[PDB]
Amino acid sequence: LEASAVIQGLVKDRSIFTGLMIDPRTKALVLNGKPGHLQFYSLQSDKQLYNLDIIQQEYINDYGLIQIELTKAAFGCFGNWLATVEQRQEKETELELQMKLWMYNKKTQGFILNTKINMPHEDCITALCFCNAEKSEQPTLVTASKDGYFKVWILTDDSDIYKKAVGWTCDFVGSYHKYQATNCCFSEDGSLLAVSFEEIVTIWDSVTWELKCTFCQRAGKIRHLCFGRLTCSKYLLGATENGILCCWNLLSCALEWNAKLNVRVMEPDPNSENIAAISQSSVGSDLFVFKPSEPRPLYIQKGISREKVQWGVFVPRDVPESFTSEAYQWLNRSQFYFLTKSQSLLTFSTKTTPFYFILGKHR
Amino acid sequence: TVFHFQLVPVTSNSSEKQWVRTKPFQHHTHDVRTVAHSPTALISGGTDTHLVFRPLMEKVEVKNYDAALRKITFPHRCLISCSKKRQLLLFQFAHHLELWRLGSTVATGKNGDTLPLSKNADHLLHLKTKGPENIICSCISPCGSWIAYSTVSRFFLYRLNYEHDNISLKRVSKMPAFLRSALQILFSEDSTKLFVASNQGALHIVQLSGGSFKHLHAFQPQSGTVEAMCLLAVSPDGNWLAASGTSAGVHVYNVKQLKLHCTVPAYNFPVTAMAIAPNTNNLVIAHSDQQVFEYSIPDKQYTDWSRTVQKQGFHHLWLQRDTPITHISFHPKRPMHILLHDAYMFCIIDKSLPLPNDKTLLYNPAHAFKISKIYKPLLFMDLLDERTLVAVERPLDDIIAQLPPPIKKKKFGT
Amino acid sequence: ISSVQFHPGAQIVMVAGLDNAVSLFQVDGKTNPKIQSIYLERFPIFKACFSANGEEVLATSTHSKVLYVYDMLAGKLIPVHQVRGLKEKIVRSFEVSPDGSFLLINGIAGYLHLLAMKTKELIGSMKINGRVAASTFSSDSKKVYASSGDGEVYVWDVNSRKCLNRFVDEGSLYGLSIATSRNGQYVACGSNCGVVNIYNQDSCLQETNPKPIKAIMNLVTGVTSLTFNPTTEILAIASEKMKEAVRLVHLPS
Amino acid sequence: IHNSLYGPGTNRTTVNKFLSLANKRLPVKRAAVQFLNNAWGIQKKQNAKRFKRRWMVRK
Amino acid sequence: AITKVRTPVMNSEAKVLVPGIPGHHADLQTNSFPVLLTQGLESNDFEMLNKVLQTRNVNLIKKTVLRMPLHTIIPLLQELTKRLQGHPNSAVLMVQWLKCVLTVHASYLSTLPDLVPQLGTLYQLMESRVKTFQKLSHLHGKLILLITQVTKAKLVYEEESS
Amino acid sequence: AGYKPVAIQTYPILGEKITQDTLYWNNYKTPVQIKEFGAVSKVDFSPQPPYNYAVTASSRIHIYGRYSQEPIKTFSRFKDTAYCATFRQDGRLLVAGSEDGGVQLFDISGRAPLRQFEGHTKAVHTVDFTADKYHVVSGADDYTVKLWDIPNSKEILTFKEHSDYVRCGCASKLNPDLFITGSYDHTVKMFDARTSESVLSVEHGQPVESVLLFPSGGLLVSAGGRYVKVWDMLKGGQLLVSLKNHHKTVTCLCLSSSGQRLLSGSLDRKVKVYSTTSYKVVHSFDYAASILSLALAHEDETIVVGMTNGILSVKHRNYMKQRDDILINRPAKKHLELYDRDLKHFRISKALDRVLDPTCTIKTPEITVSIIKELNRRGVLANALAGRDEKEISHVLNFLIRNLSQPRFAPVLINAAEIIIDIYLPVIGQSPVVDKKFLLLQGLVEKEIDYQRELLETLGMMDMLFATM
RNA sequence: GAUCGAUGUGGUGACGUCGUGCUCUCCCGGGCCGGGUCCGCGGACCCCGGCCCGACCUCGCGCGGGGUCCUCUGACGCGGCAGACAGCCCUCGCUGUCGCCGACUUGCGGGCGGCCCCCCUCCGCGGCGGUGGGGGUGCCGUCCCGCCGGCCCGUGCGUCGGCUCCG
């Protein structure tokens, strides 16, 4: 009565609060696994690498008990920094919210806790992102919440005469018109930050934390927000609840185009200008690959899945493919994966013992 | 916990057999120190003063009330004596006697309402015996001036006076030796005559007058095999005395004539209680089975109502009751109504109303047996007056409280 | 040095001792080269023995629950710390059957525990009156010989855990060791006074008071070790309480 | 016979405690069956003398 | 035993950030006792600091802060900040002192030194402490409901042997 | 997997009272008092393994050992008074001073001085050896400082560059002929190198009582009045840090065995211990009288302080693996706390009883609060709290009374109070003690609410004065 | 009431802490100052306001001093120890082990290892580490000979005091 082997692929969980992420060090899929754990899973072979425990507390399967839930996670400068968000909601009046910073110690080869903040916000955190610019002198983390505030944390020297150490300290607090902050994003350079306050989007300068612009299209609240990459970095893309996808030009401070498309999953390719959108039609999900510069699709696919697609991700492929046609070119830079409601992961494919002699087993 | 082990064959074809545990039972909360195996039942006795008979379903030939679970906690005999005139209650323990006086109330209410009282229940007398021997029986005079109680070796009678709001006890100087072991002590309606039943078959009549005793007459042992302990009933006129405890049957003697009057025809089940009507002079007799008889002392025959009940037969819900009848009461104002009670129920029966049958329902949580279960554990009840009743009751949890400590058990939720 | 044993099928000798190392050596008369040595952290070896097939090494320690199994063919060291259904606190005394299908563990309150060799799971238990001093397996591995603390020896059946016979060793207040021959002809019992009694195996099975073939009175202090020659011509007796207390016995004579 | 079934080393509780386990699982929670304790109120001075040293270490 | 769960190390060297600490957010008269107060602030002697500070008379505090030297109000601010963390019995007097100093003497004055970070710590501490008001009100309501709910034998006879 | 112990919540405290320096500076035993006649001007330890200290007072220089209430030796042949007894680096000779002006060399085993120097005309108060153990530097009240040779018994050199009483001299162990002198003329001059004039001078705002040299880095610390000033020699006359933490004159300044610790004694019955790296106070010592002399033994073993009055205070403090063997590591058993063992086997009531132990409640209330939080997390707090008599609930009420007002423990204890109020409502009237405990809890509740309302008013005022700027 | 097919309603492993328990219980504190409340000036009660507070006798003048001890809630196990040539198993054993209050549970040594405080190589799918070298006052654990032991005399000793062991 002891475990000798475990056969498991992707962990099945009731709710996947975090998105589908990739650990930069292992190039492995990171998502929600066991309750209180993050599953690291190998994509090439259907084998689970391991589970990483964030909250080290006992779990009881008794019914009708509120359980601490790991809602958001993020990887910072390469894989060095990991930010985890946990919460307990027993009653609507009081919320327990806790945020943890883990620094990867390469001597140990594991993560170690650096900073723990209890009640960073008064309400649920909705967004969590890092500055992956490498031209910003200090790492920066931004947390947005429904309370109407977004807080900017920076890594500062915490050394004393007794001990030498580094830690995270609060840098900036921002709010606009007493509105719930829904999404936040960084530019390709990290010089500007785009944060969504319900229907409106505000653009701030990250260097001096001064507001730079405000876009308010009277369509609906913003579900998804992203920046353009590479030659389309000047563009910003925003999807509303009322089925409108609109592209703003930061240089012109005006919208270039808008379209009637209700999208649930929108992911920017890190190594390409392509944007892939998953629209939930009644018959099934549909995939649209386009570029922010041109308002027409580059590739359209229908009937990718009968079931609703809840998350999507782009993974950089090591050896780039070669497809000359513009419809098939988006497959060159990176591979696309998507996870549906039934937790099924789908993608697009175009195709010793020396004793044997010492003990005389040979006779 | 009581565990049953059975010998079972390993397989049908093989003749080899193995011992396995099959049935656990939890009818006790304390130590179970002794068990017995009947051919069809398991008997268990524990220090929680419960006697449990559990028949086994696989070993009973017929399915009926005999296969039902049986639990015995309460005694089968009356331990409380009542003096109606002076509102006095006497309680019998192993080594001492307690005497209380009831408290009256002046408030009036309707339906179920708690009336505030004027004077509380008051504990008068606490008399302790000498020696290790236990009390067999005790009795109070209806007037309230005489207390009698017996042990295996000595008989004690006391004259008590209620003077200056103070109780005073005086022991009689001498008593005869043949009263040393009384099975039953009974006082007549007047303080003049005392009736004593001896351990061996004998009856003794004693004249009590001014603190003076005279042994009038000794009734000879009743013929027949002794089947149960004697029970004594005195008629309210004082003319007749009814005694039981033999296979011959209940014998009724004329006290004034000092000779036997009649003998009730014998019933195989033992007698549990007897009582005598005030004016009609009718003896009601209850047995171990729930059947009841009524017999006319002057007519020397069964009454017409008793014949009607015996021909019709009792209700089957009445018959299927574990506890026996421990006390029966009459009232002179109402001859038609007879009161009786058991441990878990009490009945008032009207002879004029038509008898119930199996189709009708006996008790609902016209109809002859008006039976109620409001006072769940009943140790005593009596008709104090024509609207006044006294009911002495003992909750089980109070008995559990005064018990030796049990073994610790781990519970799920705690 | 707690234990020394020769490998059944190869010229390999294994030496284990109070120092936590277990070593295997190439058996050569001149040099005896070292093959491999393994050091455990806090495990002073009370007894180490080879398996009947010789493929794995089993070791135990003084006042330690875990039993160490070293599989040489697979190169795996499996510590058996938990045996399901076993209430024993520490495991120090144990024996292995010649055929290799059973392992016997000496316990407390006169309890003998039988375990399967391949899976290390408990099969059943045998209880004797008094303490268990020593135990051994029969040549055919169908019976168990157990010597009690009052000088009485019990015979148990392996397949059905029943006591076949109970005989008494002559003039033994308490026994310390017991051994059996490979051919099944001799059974030897050691006692406190240093007297070793040799019996026919048939005599032990059928007689409550067997008469030994010969009682060896040469040793004067309590015999703790008994070992039979594979050809059944030499019996080696020893006592650890005195120096130079080892003798060799010619079995037929 | 007393020490065998009620002596040190046995697993015994109080009758108040044993009946109080049911109250901890009722749909409406209740207190102990016998709430008042006579031994608590009567003793006020003996506690101070014996445990005079203990409170020093805690502070 | 094969379990595919890895545990990061959580030790006591990690920094904890609660909302109450800075890193979470962002003519001969006895009418006054000024020189006693400044002597107490120079050397942190608990006794005479209590004697000067643990008072209730409002005009005493007014005249004490009015006659107070101007370059030592900041040590007063640290001492009040230290002493506000406690049972309300001593803390209410300290709140009265803080109101008195902040109200009349330095309403115009405090804007000049521009030393807002020093009082910012007290600001965050006060905001952290005032969080449980509605829960305390609920507890008080149930306590008031609770308080509303709040408001032998004469003769023993032993027989003698005979 | 394996069982996980309950998390123990830690709450930071604004004060930094608990420090490793605090543990290192409070290890010491009770002070011991030695009676003497006259003020103790200074106390000096000897660096030899038999560490002893010389206390100079009035006309007597006493040599005391460790413990040893009575002096082990006494030099009393001083005509009026003695000044500045100091040991040599070899612990065999000691320099002394007198109001006559003669500098006296004494052997630690003799009775009469070995060498007498008669150059000074008035009282001499500071004398010290050099880096080499055969020259001495002395300074007197006749405004001059003189360098003397011990074997030659004549004065090597004289300096006259001071305007008041010269009464504090120090020398450098690293470099011979490099010495620093202090006077009441507010200036500290460094007579050094091989030259006939001072190379560097330093200005202090008050008369200089004490000066000391840090051996490494060329840092000079000077005490004047309340001020203690640090000057750097890497660039001449550079005041790095000037500090004041005393409310009277700083009398003496001493250096610990470790370079990081610096001790300053003053006239106001307080001694401050600083770290040199941060130049901030790390410890304080309080004494019965003013500290005239402060002295430290090897490491920080013994602290000696000499007062204005005669008495002075002394403060004391099997087989192994062979190389060729292969190593196998056995797991080490992990020990769970008793409440963790109860929670592992679901003894919620027993765990609550354990954490309600008065020792646990007093020493570590945080553990009890964390266990109550864990019971609330499991949803079995009501089960554990219910089913108890007056005695058991009274201790819970006492703990709540003592700990409800605390801001760190407020929410969970408020919830526990809610639960016990809901459960124990019907049985209230029987017991007076539970009534008293409920009344105390109630009263604490109103006073906390009034406190918070006052806090809200002050919050509004602070909001105003913040938004002004 | 119970009740004649009845079934205790139901909670989570493991590897020498060779001083400790999922065991049951004892208490919920006292004496002072700075205050603040309430009640009828008086009293009573509260304070992450600060203070202190071992038992036991004795002498002198209830007071004060002096000493003695001073490890602390009691049982019950567990572990250890002590007794058989044998015992994790046995005991009305002892909870350091013994003398008859005291000796003892050391002492100095030698030797090895483990890790770190910093600067100079070599390798890293190179963010940062290992791999080599050094220096840091650098602190530690274990292993044996220690000062072979055991009896009997003689007078701390007993030039070859004896018999035995150890070596």
PDB file of C-alpha atoms in Angstrom, chain F residues 170-318:
ATOM      1  CA  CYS F 170      45.188  58.988  22.617  1.00  0.00           C
ATOM      2  CA  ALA F 171      47.770  57.093  20.581  1.00  0.00           C
ATOM      3  CA  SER F 172      47.683  54.848  17.520  1.00  0.00           C
ATOM      4  CA  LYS F 173      48.582  51.179  17.870  1.00  0.00           C
ATOM      5  CA  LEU F 174      49.227  50.919  14.123  1.00  0.00           C
ATOM      6  CA  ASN F 175      51.778  53.730  13.715  1.00  0.00           C
ATOM      7  CA  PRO F 176      54.338  54.915  16.300  1.00  0.00           C
ATOM      8  CA  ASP F 177      54.712  58.659  16.993  1.00  0.00           C
ATOM      9  CA  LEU F 178      51.156  59.134  15.626  1.00  0.00           C
ATOM     10  CA  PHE F 179      49.079  60.457  18.525  1.00  0.00           C
ATOM     11  CA  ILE F 180      46.056  62.689  19.093  1.00  0.00           C
ATOM     12  CA  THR F 181      45.426  65.021  22.019  1.00  0.00           C
ATOM     13  CA  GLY F 182      42.362  66.745  23.483  1.00  0.00           C
ATOM     14  CA  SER F 183      41.751  69.864  25.563  1.00  0.00           C
ATOM     15  CA  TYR F 184      39.060  72.226  26.840  1.00  0.00           C
ATOM     16  CA  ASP F 185      40.041  74.821  24.200  1.00  0.00           C
ATOM     17  CA  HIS F 186      37.424  73.225  21.859  1.00  0.00           C
ATOM     18  CA  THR F 187      40.171  72.014  19.475  1.00  0.00           C
ATOM     19  CA  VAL F 188      41.701  68.583  18.867  1.00  0.00           C
ATOM     20  CA  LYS F 189      45.174  68.645  17.313  1.00  0.00           C
ATOM     21  CA  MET F 190      47.024  65.660  15.845  1.00  0.00           C
ATOM     22  CA  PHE F 191      50.716  65.831  16.761  1.00  0.00           C
ATOM     23  CA  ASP F 192      52.182  63.130  14.591  1.00  0.00           C
ATOM     24  CA  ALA F 193      54.587  62.003  11.817  1.00  0.00           C
ATOM     25  CA  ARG F 194      58.184  63.183  12.484  1.00  0.00           C
ATOM     26  CA  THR F 195      57.730  66.958  12.588  1.00  0.00           C
ATOM     27  CA  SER F 196      57.794  69.810  15.117  1.00  0.00           C
ATOM     28  CA  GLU F 197      54.270  71.083  14.381  1.00  0.00           C
ATOM     29  CA  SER F 198      50.769  69.629  14.172  1.00  0.00           C
ATOM     30  CA  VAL F 199      49.810  68.284  10.750  1.00  0.00           C
ATOM     31  CA  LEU F 200      46.026  68.356  11.248  1.00  0.00           C
ATOM     32  CA  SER F 201      43.570  70.166  13.513  1.00  0.00           C
ATOM     33  CA  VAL F 202      39.874  69.645  14.237  1.00  0.00           C
ATOM     34  CA  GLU F 203      37.319  72.080  15.661  1.00  0.00           C
ATOM     35  CA  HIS F 204      34.690  70.959  18.177  1.00  0.00           C
ATOM     36  CA  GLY F 205      31.849  73.186  19.328  1.00  0.00           C
ATOM     37  CA  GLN F 206      32.189  72.320  23.037  1.00  0.00           C
ATOM     38  CA  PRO F 207      35.070  71.370  25.378  1.00  0.00           C
ATOM     39  CA  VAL F 208      36.408  67.958  24.389  1.00  0.00           C
ATOM     40  CA  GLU F 209      35.972  65.303  27.073  1.00  0.00           C
ATOM     41  CA  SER F 210      37.021  62.148  25.210  1.00  0.00           C
ATOM     42  CA  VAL F 211      38.678  61.169  21.926  1.00  0.00           C
ATOM     43  CA  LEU F 212      39.205  57.678  20.501  1.00  0.00           C
ATOM     44  CA  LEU F 213      40.794  56.134  17.403  1.00  0.00           C
ATOM     45  CA  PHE F 214      39.238  53.394  15.315  1.00  0.00           C
ATOM     46  CA  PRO F 215      42.199  51.143  14.384  1.00  0.00           C
ATOM     47  CA  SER F 216      41.069  50.549  10.780  1.00  0.00           C
ATOM     48  CA  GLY F 217      40.050  53.282   8.346  1.00  0.00           C
ATOM     49  CA  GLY F 218      41.480  56.304  10.158  1.00  0.00           C
ATOM     50  CA  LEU F 219      38.283  57.360  11.931  1.00  0.00           C
ATOM     51  CA  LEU F 220      38.502  59.679  14.945  1.00  0.00           C
ATOM     52  CA  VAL F 221      35.545  59.989  17.328  1.00  0.00           C
ATOM     53  CA  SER F 222      35.347  62.985  19.667  1.00  0.00           C
ATOM     54  CA  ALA F 223      32.896  63.809  22.459  1.00  0.00           C
ATOM     55  CA  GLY F 224      31.958  67.353  23.413  1.00  0.00           C
ATOM     56  CA  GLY F 225      28.906  68.213  25.480  1.00  0.00           C
ATOM     57  CA  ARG F 226      25.967  66.297  24.060  1.00  0.00           C
ATOM     58  CA  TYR F 227      27.607  66.012  20.638  1.00  0.00           C
ATOM     59  CA  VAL F 228      29.639  63.030  19.443  1.00  0.00           C
ATOM     60  CA  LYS F 229      31.379  63.725  16.134  1.00  0.00           C
ATOM     61  CA  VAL F 230      33.108  61.358  13.697  1.00  0.00           C
ATOM     62  CA  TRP F 231      35.980  62.661  11.557  1.00  0.00           C
ATOM     63  CA  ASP F 232      37.665  60.901   8.642  1.00  0.00           C
ATOM     64  CA  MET F 233      41.394  60.983   7.879  1.00  0.00           C
ATOM     65  CA  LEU F 234      41.108  59.838   4.251  1.00  0.00           C
ATOM     66  CA  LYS F 235      40.315  63.481   3.463  1.00  0.00           C
ATOM     67  CA  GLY F 236      41.425  65.849   6.214  1.00  0.00           C
ATOM     68  CA  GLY F 237      38.881  67.245   8.663  1.00  0.00           C
ATOM     69  CA  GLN F 238      35.796  65.563   7.193  1.00  0.00           C
ATOM     70  CA  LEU F 239      32.901  65.417   9.674  1.00  0.00           C
ATOM     71  CA  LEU F 240      31.014  62.298   8.610  1.00  0.00           C
ATOM     72  CA  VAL F 241      28.344  61.952  11.316  1.00  0.00           C
ATOM     73  CA  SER F 242      27.501  64.188  14.272  1.00  0.00           C
ATOM     74  CA  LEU F 243      25.082  62.574  16.714  1.00  0.00           C
ATOM     75  CA  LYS F 244      23.302  63.561  19.921  1.00  0.00           C
ATOM     76  CA  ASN F 245      21.297  61.025  21.932  1.00  0.00           C
ATOM     77  CA  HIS F 246      22.085  62.202  25.486  1.00  0.00           C
ATOM     78  CA  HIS F 247      20.551  65.110  27.409  1.00  0.00           C
ATOM     79  CA  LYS F 248      23.782  65.907  29.298  1.00  0.00           C
ATOM     80  CA  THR F 249      27.506  66.011  28.601  1.00  0.00           C
ATOM     81  CA  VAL F 250      29.002  62.868  27.057  1.00  0.00           C
ATOM     82  CA  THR F 251      31.748  61.844  29.478  1.00  0.00           C
ATOM     83  CA  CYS F 252      33.431  58.796  27.953  1.00  0.00           C
ATOM     84  CA  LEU F 253      33.608  56.932  24.645  1.00  0.00           C
ATOM     85  CA  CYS F 254      34.758  53.316  24.291  1.00  0.00           C
ATOM     86  CA  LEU F 255      35.149  50.786  21.484  1.00  0.00           C
ATOM     87  CA  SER F 256      34.062  47.152  21.615  1.00  0.00           C
ATOM     88  CA  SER F 257      36.168  44.166  20.592  1.00  0.00           C
ATOM     89  CA  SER F 258      34.205  44.043  17.350  1.00  0.00           C
ATOM     90  CA  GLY F 259      34.742  47.137  15.232  1.00  0.00           C
ATOM     91  CA  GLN F 260      31.031  47.511  14.488  1.00  0.00           C
ATOM     92  CA  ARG F 261      29.950  48.234  18.075  1.00  0.00           C
ATOM     93  CA  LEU F 262      30.662  51.592  19.732  1.00  0.00           C
ATOM     94  CA  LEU F 263      29.703  52.457  23.319  1.00  0.00           C
ATOM     95  CA  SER F 264      29.203  55.991  24.651  1.00  0.00           C
ATOM     96  CA  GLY F 265      28.732  56.771  28.338  1.00  0.00           C
ATOM     97  CA  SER F 266      27.579  60.165  29.562  1.00  0.00           C
ATOM     98  CA  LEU F 267      26.599  62.147  32.653  1.00  0.00           C
ATOM     99  CA  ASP F 268      22.876  61.316  32.538  1.00  0.00           C
ATOM    100  CA  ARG F 269      22.897  57.689  33.790  1.00  0.00           C
ATOM    101  CA  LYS F 270      22.629  56.232  30.292  1.00  0.00           C
ATOM    102  CA  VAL F 271      25.002  54.449  27.916  1.00  0.00           C
ATOM    103  CA  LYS F 272      24.275  54.206  24.190  1.00  0.00           C
ATOM    104  CA  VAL F 273      25.485  51.372  21.947  1.00  0.00           C
ATOM    105  CA  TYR F 274      25.756  52.220  18.239  1.00  0.00           C
ATOM    106  CA  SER F 275      26.651  50.420  15.042  1.00  0.00           C
ATOM    107  CA  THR F 276      29.463  52.179  13.188  1.00  0.00           C
ATOM    108  CA  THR F 277      28.163  51.080   9.776  1.00  0.00           C
ATOM    109  CA  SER F 278      24.823  52.881  10.179  1.00  0.00           C
ATOM    110  CA  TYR F 279      25.798  55.372  12.934  1.00  0.00           C
ATOM    111  CA  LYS F 280      22.442  54.712  14.629  1.00  0.00           C
ATOM    112  CA  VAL F 281      21.611  53.643  18.173  1.00  0.00           C
ATOM    113  CA  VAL F 282      21.151  49.896  18.586  1.00  0.00           C
ATOM    114  CA  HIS F 283      21.030  49.524  22.390  1.00  0.00           C
ATOM    115  CA  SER F 284      20.654  51.467  25.633  1.00  0.00           C
ATOM    116  CA  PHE F 285      21.850  50.844  29.196  1.00  0.00           C
ATOM    117  CA  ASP F 286      20.492  52.556  32.316  1.00  0.00           C
ATOM    118  CA  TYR F 287      22.454  52.955  35.552  1.00  0.00           C
ATOM    119  CA  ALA F 288      21.906  54.365  39.036  1.00  0.00           C
ATOM    120  CA  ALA F 289      24.479  57.183  38.782  1.00  0.00           C
ATOM    121  CA  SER F 290      26.302  59.174  36.115  1.00  0.00           C
ATOM    122  CA  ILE F 291      28.862  57.202  34.093  1.00  0.00           C
ATOM    123  CA  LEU F 292      32.327  58.704  34.448  1.00  0.00           C
ATOM    124  CA  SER F 293      34.253  55.622  33.280  1.00  0.00           C
ATOM    125  CA  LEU F 294      33.303  52.843  30.846  1.00  0.00           C
ATOM    126  CA  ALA F 295      35.509  49.797  30.281  1.00  0.00           C
ATOM    127  CA  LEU F 296      35.187  46.612  28.214  1.00  0.00           C
ATOM    128  CA  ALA F 297      37.015  43.296  28.591  1.00  0.00           C
ATOM    129  CA  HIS F 298      38.136  40.810  25.938  1.00  0.00           C
ATOM    130  CA  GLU F 299      35.229  40.154  23.578  1.00  0.00           C
ATOM    131  CA  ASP F 300      32.425  41.874  25.563  1.00  0.00           C
ATOM    132  CA  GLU F 301      32.869  39.572  28.559  1.00  0.00           C
ATOM    133  CA  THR F 302      32.876  42.149  31.384  1.00  0.00           C
ATOM    134  CA  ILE F 303      31.420  45.676  31.495  1.00  0.00           C
ATOM    135  CA  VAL F 304      32.798  48.016  34.175  1.00  0.00           C
ATOM    136  CA  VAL F 305      31.242  51.429  34.818  1.00  0.00           C
ATOM    137  CA  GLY F 306      32.571  53.903  37.382  1.00  0.00           C
ATOM    138  CA  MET F 307      30.179  56.508  38.738  1.00  0.00           C
ATOM    139  CA  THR F 308      30.366  60.019  40.165  1.00  0.00           C
ATOM    140  CA  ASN F 309      30.121  58.435  43.617  1.00  0.00           C
ATOM    141  CA  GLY F 310      32.505  55.832  44.989  1.00  0.00           C
ATOM    142  CA  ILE F 311      30.660  52.643  44.065  1.00  0.00           C
ATOM    143  CA  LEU F 312      31.161  51.146  40.608  1.00  0.00           C
ATOM    144  CA  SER F 313      29.225  48.465  38.748  1.00  0.00           C
ATOM    145  CA  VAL F 314      30.637  45.275  37.220  1.00  0.00           C
ATOM    146  CA  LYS F 315      28.543  43.264  34.732  1.00  0.00           C
ATOM    147  CA  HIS F 316      29.659  39.716  33.907  1.00  0.00           C
ATOM    148  CA  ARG F 317      28.266  37.284  31.354  1.00  0.00           C
ATOM    149  CA  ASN F 318      28.876   6.619  16.547  1.00  0.00           C
TER     150      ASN F 318
END
